């Protein structure tokens, strides 16, 4: 039994798990940070950004005065955003012979897996997550490719110039797979594979191995795997929440007897209470519609905004807000409000076209990809970056947000950070653990040392025994059982 | 270092004891083989030595891996070839079944190309494993190792045709492809069919086996199937006819199975056999056009456009009927634009039989013209093609069709003109049925739509060889050139080498006479360059001349590095220009690539509104000609009034391919900018982009009108 992890980040898990027979693929994702690094790709032609004093080496032994560009103290690559990926050296992705899936957030990277290197298995997820996954994809896609700036920049990319680039480029990790997106046919091509799936349907291996989906409570469809042999149980658990939201609440009384219970996709806010930042959110928003000014709500068009909206709409009859619209602006509005539907917001395909007739200020924009480089959220930050009154609420823990704010430095508006994560806090999954009995634990290196930000602590660290054994980016554990 | 540190790991290797550290040790051996230079070949017997006494299984798995690797970097030494061979049939009874593959690969890509055990044989024995993954890479083997030249046996088929009734997926795809492979090596053979005392060529039994195949219950195969039936040539007429027979429901009646599968992609691939296969036989195209004209029915539209294309590709093997004629021209009436263009080139080349089915198909295009007005362009070129195909059946409407006068602005009665024209060009008879008003419009359309309407009753070929030979002096020069561009707006079909020798003197004269100037010359050497097509080497040396000229011109130090990379990638024209700083150019046989912005017009008083700081979308809709791979040279450029200037790439997948030589681009542009006051203009035309790193206008712009309302 072998675990070959992948992905090094911590809530974008990936990971091989190889078996006596099948060699499986644990829910491949994507990070998605990389894209911080580069400048945004705005509609028009943004004229605060394309007359940046382009930055300069010391030296100047090469003409670098093209590729990266100098804004408020940082400088950052011109190109589009070549996305993160998981590495692709240690196994071949050939032999691999099944994928599962956990739920959308992370199966960004099947296009990336499946259709570029030839692979040969089929790839299960129940339906309400390639539902809501193609959707993702689907604004990714369409969000890129609206204004290509296919323009690259190859310098930078040595080992030798990178160590003589300071921070945050120097921090930067494996530059060298490092991959402008997908396209359409790719992602559309990729998405016929699936095999889809419902709860405790069991599922055979090659009369080898058995797997199976839990209900797991983060979204819907959102899912817990188990796969089982004859003589071995590993519990995949990626990404539950207990809090009882709409989705069927999880199953936490199958996953005992496990021998391997391989847990990631815990919060990365461990210091936040998610009730308590709802509160901040819809206290910011009320305080900066209730002057005269905007808001603009960075959010992924699926999960998280399902709850906010919810909680949003008892504010809107506790607080007497009737005055102002609430928007959804992205490419896959319909879609996305119908399987929300089927399993006061005037939802819009595109800035462009319709929505234009409707703009009444105050409101209220929900917008598309949150880590302020792509989509439309470029528009508005370049249309609401000089008025004191406007603010941005920043909802989404996966890009840090200091960094993701930068480039549009120096901004005068408001930049709140209420972050809202309905994933396993650290008391509950201990909790969770001694509930559940698993004979080991597997997570990454994040976890099982406190958080660098705040050293002092020592409650957040995942405390279980025998001690849990950790992974880092790209490397190869033994899960130590002798059959 | 490389063998002092590989030896330090492998020792390293030989005291670790943990597989996982072994595994990553084996990992960096893996990754540091491929040293282009090295001679790891001396840590081939140590590798041997490594594999003789293991315990694990990807162990083995991953070495034999980097084996395989650096035997195809050597693959003329056949004896550490068979080496290979030989410790690879030692390890290929292995009972894990990564190895295996790992072997089974080996065998595949390091393979006796000669006809010393047979390995095929061997590999062949492993249809019949456990693990069907053995068998799929087995057979993936079989694929490679004839795909290197080695011609195989006979008896692969008889024993591949057990697999058909296997149940699985990928097995069932490889085992169809070594059917076709296997009798695309022996087809006429003479097999019996068990089932009766009958005896057809193998061909037959092939063709009959892989079409049964396409009902399988998995749609994977079903494509896989589809497409590899549509390069079947030598199979026997019969038997292709029989596929149709609707009435007989698996050897037969496939194609109909096919085209009205749940999965259209299944529809597509049988769609692109039937074309293949009836470009081969004319007869089995007149039979199976009757379900061909019924894909046109169907519900999505790809499946649409590339039975369209096909059918198109047929059109002299093919017969149309008045049925066939109305079924077809009523689907001008859709709505998607790329199938009216589609079927526009289609008409082109259809051969009709009568008289009013001609009639109806102008009725038809008329309509089309009058619902969809943007077309225009396309429709009169193919009433060019209309009227110069079938002289016979228009023969009696130019009478009716000829009808008080209409205006010279309607686009129904210049089409029936140019039209009536071209059938006149073919049959000098209906000059004299020609009204006086008649002769006035044709002469209008001629100095005019030269382009669309024929010259009515070569000589133009010796008077441009002539012409060219005179020049071989400003007064010649200008003469000569007023002459080819007359000869090019007389003649279309010979306008491209009169433009291009056109573009040649001018630069001629211009550097005889000869700081602009200079720069006109580059520019025009660029666009003799670029734009044009089916250029040859001679051509490009004398235009490298040119620019070699232009650039010692406009020098009155990187001169001398770029004539010394100009005498390295041409060695060969050195010889051959003797004599160079007059060069003959020869004119050979030519287009000129232009694009023509349609949509939107622009001269609508009616603007595009938008509001105080917003984007607001305009979608550009312009054909191509004769454009070489448009995907990568060309771009639409954006001027404000301010004097800015947006170039935006377009995608790949928004240039749309109607036909041979056009192109379709359909695309988004996003307008705006800073606050703006008042409706004001903007330009939006094309570009081409050339790396020798540079542009080229080569259409008419389009000045669109934006107007602003503050929002509410």
């Not at chain 2, 013209?369 to 059946?393: E, N, V």
């Amino acid at each position: 039994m072998k675990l070959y992890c992948l992905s090094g980040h911590p809530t974008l898990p990936c990971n091989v798990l190889k078996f006596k027979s099948t060699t499986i693929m644990l829910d491949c994702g994507l990070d998605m940070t990389s894209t911080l690094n580069f400048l945004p790709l705005p509609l028009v032609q943004s004229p605060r950004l394309s007359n940046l004093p382009g930055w300069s080496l010391k030296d100047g032994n090469a003409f670098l005065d093209k590729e990266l560009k100098e804004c408020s103290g940082h400088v950052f690559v011109d190109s589009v955003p070549e996305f993160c990926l998981p590495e692709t050296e240690l196994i071949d992705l050939s032999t691999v012979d099944v994928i599962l899936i956990s739920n959308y957030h992370c199966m960004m990277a099947l296009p990336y897996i499946t259709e570029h290197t030839g692979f040969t298995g089929t790839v299960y997820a129940t339906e309400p997550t390639v539902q809501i996954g193609r959707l993702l994809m689907e604004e990714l896609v369409n969000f890129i490719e609206r204004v290509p700036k296919a323009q690259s920049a190859s310098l930078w990319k040595n080992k030798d110039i990178q160590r003589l680039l300071p921070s945050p480029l120097k921090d930067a990790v494996e530059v060298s797979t490092w991959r402008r997106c997908y396209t359409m046919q790719e992602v559309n091509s990729a998405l016929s594979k699936i095999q889809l799936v419902g709860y405790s349907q069991k599922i055979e291996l090659f009369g080898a191995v058995q797997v199976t989906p839990l209900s797991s409570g983060y979204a819907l469809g959102s899912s817990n795997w188990i796969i089982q042999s004859h003589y071995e149980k590993v519990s995949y658990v990626s990404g539950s929440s207990l809090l009882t939201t709409h989705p069927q609440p999880m199953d936490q009384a199958s996953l005992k007897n496990s021998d391997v219970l391989v847990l990631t996709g815990l919060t990365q806010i461990p210091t936040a209470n998610p009730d308590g930042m709802v509160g901040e959110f819809c206290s910011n928003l009320a305080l900066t519609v209730r002057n005269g000014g905007n808001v603009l709500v960075p959010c992924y068009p699926s999960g998280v905004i399902y709850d906010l909206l919810e909680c949003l709409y008892q504010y809107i009859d506790s607080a007497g807000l009737s005055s102002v619209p609430l928007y959804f602006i992205s490419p896959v509005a319909n879609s996305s409000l119908e399987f929300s539907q089927i399993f006061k917001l005037k939802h819009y395909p595109s800035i462009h076209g319709d929505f234009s007739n409707d703009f009444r200020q105050p409101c209220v924009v929900f917008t598309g990809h949150p880590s302020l480089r792509f989509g439309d959220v470029v528009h508005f930050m370049e249309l609401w970056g000089k008025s004191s009154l406007n603010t941005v609420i920043f909802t989404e823990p996966d890009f840090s947000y200091l960094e993701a704010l930068a480039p549009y430095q120096p901004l005068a508006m408001k930049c709140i950070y209420c972050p809202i994560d309905t994933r396993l806090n650290f008391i509950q999954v201990s909790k969770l653990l001694k509930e559940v009995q698993p004979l080991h634990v597997v997570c990454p290196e994040q976890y099982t040392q406190p958080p660098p930000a705040q050293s002092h602590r020592m409650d957040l660290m995942i405390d279980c025994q025998p001690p849990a054994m950790s992974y880092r980016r790209a490397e190869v554990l033994a899960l130590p059982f002798k059959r | 270092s490389v063998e002092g540190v590989v030896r330090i790991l492998l020792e390293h290797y030989y005291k670790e004891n943990d597989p996982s550290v072994r595994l990553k040790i084996a990992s960096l051996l893996g990754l540091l083989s491929k040293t282009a230079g090295f001679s790891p070949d001396c840590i081939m017997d140590d590798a041997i030595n490594i594999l003789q006494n293991e315990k694990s299984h990807q162990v083995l798995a991953q070495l034999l891996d980097t084996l395989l690797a650096i035997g195809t970097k050597l693959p003329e030494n056949q004896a550490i070839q068979m080496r290979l061979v030989d410790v690879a049939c030692k390890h290929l009874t292995d009972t894990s079944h990564g190895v295996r593959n790992k072997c089974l690969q080996l065998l595949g890509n390091l393979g006796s190309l000669e006809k010393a055990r047979d390995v095929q044989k061997i590999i062949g024995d492993y249809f019949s494993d456990q693990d069907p993954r053995v068998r799929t890479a087995a057979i993936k083997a079989m694929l490679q190792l004839h795909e290197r030249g080695l011609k195989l046996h006979q008896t692969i088929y008889n024993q591949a045709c057990k697999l058909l009734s296997d149940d699985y997926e990928q097995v069932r795809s490889a085992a169809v492809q070594l059917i076709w492979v296997v009798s695309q090596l022996y087809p006429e053979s003479i097999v019996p069919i068990p089932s009766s005392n009958e005896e057809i060529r193998l061909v037959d039994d092939a063709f009959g086996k892989i079409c049964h195949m396409v009902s399988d219950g998995s749609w994977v195969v079903r494509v896989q199937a589809a497409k590899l039936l549509g390069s079947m040539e030598q199979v026997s007429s019969h038997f292709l006819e029989q596929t149709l027979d609707k009435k007989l429901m698996g050897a037969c009646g496939a194609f109909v199975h096919g085209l009205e599968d749940e999965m259209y992609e299944v529809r597509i691939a049988a769609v692109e056999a039937l074309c293949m296969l009836a470009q081969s036989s004319p007869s089995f195209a007149e039979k199976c056009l009757d379900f061909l004209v019924d894909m046109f029915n169907d519900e999505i539209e790809e499946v649409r456009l590339q039975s369209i294309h096909t059918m198109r590709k047929i059109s002299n093997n093919i017969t149309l009927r008045e049925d066939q004629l109305d079924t077809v021209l009523a689907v001008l009436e859709d709505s998607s634009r790329d199938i009216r263009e589609a079927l526009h080139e289609l008409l082109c080349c259809t051969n009709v039989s009568t008289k009013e089915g001609i009639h109806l198909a102008l009725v038809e295009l008329l309509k089309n013209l009058t619902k969809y007005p943007t077309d225009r362009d396309s429709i009169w070129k193919c009433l060019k093609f209309l009227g110069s195909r079938h002289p016979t059946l228009v023969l009696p409407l130019v009478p009716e069709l000829l009808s008080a006068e209409p205006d010279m602005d309607d686009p129904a009665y210049i089409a029936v003109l140019v039209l009536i024209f071209n059938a006149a060009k073919t049959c000098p008879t209906m000059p004299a049925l020609f009204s006086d008003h008649t002769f006035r419009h044709y002469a209008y359309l001629r100095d005019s739509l030269s382009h669309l309407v024929p010259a009515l009753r070569d000589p133009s070929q010796q008077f441009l060889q002539q012409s060219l030979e005179r020049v071989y002096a400003q007064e010649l020069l200008e003469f000569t050139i007023r002459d080819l561009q007359r000869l090019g707006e007389l003649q279309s079909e010979l306008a491209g080498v009169a433009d291009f020798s056109a573009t040649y003197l001018r630069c001629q004269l211009l550097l005889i006479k000869a700081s602009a100037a200079a720069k006109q010359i580059m520019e025009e050497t660029y666009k003799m360059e670029f734009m044009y097509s089916g250029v040859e080497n001679k051509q490009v040396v004398i235009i490298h001349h040119m620019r070699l000229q232009a650039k010692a011109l406009q020098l009155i130090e990187k001169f001398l590095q770029e004539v010394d990379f100009f005498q390295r990638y041409f060695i060969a024209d050195l010889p051959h220009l003797q004599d160079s700083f007059f060069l003959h150019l020869p004119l050979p046989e030519i287009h000129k690539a232009s694009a023509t912005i349609i949509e939107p017009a622009g001269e609508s008083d009616n603007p595009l509104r938008f509001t105080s700081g917003l984007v607001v979308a305009l979608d550009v809709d312009a054909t191509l000609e004769h454009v070489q791979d448009p995907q990568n040279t060309v771009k639409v450029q954006v001027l404000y009034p301010d004097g800015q200037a947006q170039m935006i790439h377009p995608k790949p997948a928004d240039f749309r391919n109607p036909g041979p030589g056009r192109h379709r681009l359909i695309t988004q542009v996003y307008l705006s900018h800073t606050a703006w006051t008042e409706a004001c203009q903007v330009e939006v035309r094309l570009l081409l982009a050339y790396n020798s790193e540079g542009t080229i206008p080569f259409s008419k712009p389009v000045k669109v009108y934006i107007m602003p309302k503050p929002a509410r």
